From a paper:
[name] alone is a mixture of dimers and tetramers, while [name] binds [name]-[name] to form a mixture of a [name] dimer (Nap12) bound to one [name]-[name] (Nap12•[name]-[name]) and larger [name]/[name]-[name] assemblies. For comparison, we also performed cryo-EM analysis with a mixture of [name], Nap12, and excess [name]-[name] without RanGTP, which produced a heterogenous mixture of particles that included unliganded Nap12, the binary [name]•[name]-[name] complex, and small populations of two different assemblies containing [name], Nap12, and [name]-[name].
Numbering used by the authors:
A (entry chain E): 83 to 365
B (entry chain D): 81 to 365
Write the structure that this text describes.
């Protein structure tokens, strides 16, 4: 205030500082573009590792002796001696071992250990998550900057929906939010092609067969009511803000905070750290 | 669950070991990514250097704004709300001879630090007295030698009465390996020895003097005593370790002092200097 009340030398110097602030903001925009470029570059390196562990998880690929030995040495260095093999386990025959190809409930176990997301999982969700093979992540290059999430389900054996893959998208605002980070814009996601309502874990179901007391027509009914589930992660909050959504926008904002927290958790912890979160060592 | 872990078939344990190996490879990739980020950040620090130097010249009064920069600032003021800078008729009547009697921006950096939440707690009035002579706050990235960043504080020896050092700097150091989350993690920090002009001006100590005809020792003797005290300039001379005392005393020392010190260093580096102006006016809050 008084700095404005100070002579126009001080005001004019502040004006120059603000012009330099705008120029610095331009340099900052350049830096942000550069760091997203670098992040994409190294995400291309992340993807092979994540896909490899996903193939191991689903059982689509097998380990190798050198990898097992390296993990042995690392675990001994980690002090997490629980993973260590014992002779009683060695006694198991191959016929006993191959009864399951992938790690049972790998992701479900990992998501159960993960702090916030585990609260979202219901029993039917847990059963569904058993068919979850992989979680993949991607960055949005066009238009608004943002990052996208992918899940792969073995839809062939999945009894609940035909969606081979589900994708979830996040958006950021146009300009650099203050403090030189990117702040969120609303999110969008897929809709699930449930095979039927009984198998729809986002829904609880009622069956009714009736003869209408008013018209005396004969009818059989299939009825639906939505419920909370891990897959409420999809059907994300509709819009950041719009005139018709305001009453919805209350829930959209709250669920947006929660869903951004969930996605941030996935992005930083789970997809970059899966093994420890499965084993619980990440706790 | 230990029981479930035991239940894991030997094949499943082998697969888990392979997965942990993959996680280690991921940590290696994260190391490479952090190296690239550090180098790019150094490059854009080089690009920031001109603008920061120019604003420093403006702050010190060594340079005067041009009408072009003035008009651009006026436009940016018309944007959002900064009409505090819109110059009024009463000021245009003034003359540079009257205005330039105060050259530069009084207490620009001291004001900037005080608005900064965490660090301002450490600054005392005795520290503050030095900070009016602060006219620059600079960053350096320790590309050579141990990784980390160094902070630079500048003064005028001919102006300040406290020390003969034109520049005071603080340093922070990282471990050779990344943290678990993939971010950088810390090593012991170090600070400069302040070349105080005299102990009386020195602000990291409180002193007392006595004189005794000590019959207990039959000594006509003069004595001096020095006590460390709390002050922001304790931000320099950070803690160090000695093995035996380390595990009892410096364990808690490292638990507390290092946490506060790293928090303050990162807060300066990230929040303050890139927004050196908004923090001074307070808009950066």
């Amino acid at each position: 205030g008084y700095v404005g009340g100070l002579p126009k030398n001080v005001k004019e110097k502040l004006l120059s500082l603000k012009t330099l602030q705008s120029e610095l903001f331009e340099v900052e925009k350049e830096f942000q573009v550069e760091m997203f470029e670098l992040e994409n570059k190294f995400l291309q390196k992340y993807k092979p590792i994540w896909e490899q562990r996903s193939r191991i998880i689903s059982g689509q690929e097998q380990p190798k002796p050198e990898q097992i030995a390296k993990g042995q040495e690392i675990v001994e260095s980690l002090n997490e001696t629980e993973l260590l093999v014992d002779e009683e386990e060695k006694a198991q025959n191959d016929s006993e071992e191959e009864q399951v190809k992938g790690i049972p409930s790998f992701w479900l176990t990992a998501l159960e250990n993960l702090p916030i997301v585990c609260d979202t999982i219901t029993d039917r969700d847990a059963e569904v998550l058993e068919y979850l093979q992989d979680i993949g992540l991607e960055y949005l290059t066009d238009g608004r900057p943002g990052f996208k999430l992918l899940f792969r389900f073995d839809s062939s054996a999945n009894p609940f929906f035909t969606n081979d893959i589900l994708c979830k998208t996040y958006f950021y605002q146009k300009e650099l939010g203050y403090s030189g980070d990117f702040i969120y814009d609303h999110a969008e996601g897929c809709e699930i092609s449930w095979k039927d309502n009984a198998h729809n874990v986002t829904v609880d179901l009622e069956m009714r067969k009736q003869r209408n007391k008013t018209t005396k027509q004969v009818r059989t009914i299939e009825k639906i009511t939505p419920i909370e589930s891990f897959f409420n992660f999809f059907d994300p909050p509709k819009i950041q803000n719009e005139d018709q959504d305001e009453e919805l926008e209350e829930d959209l904002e709250e669920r947006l905070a929660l869903d951004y927290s969930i996605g941030e958790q996935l992005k930083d912890k789970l997809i970059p750290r899966a093994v420890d979160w499965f084993t619980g060592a990440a706790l």
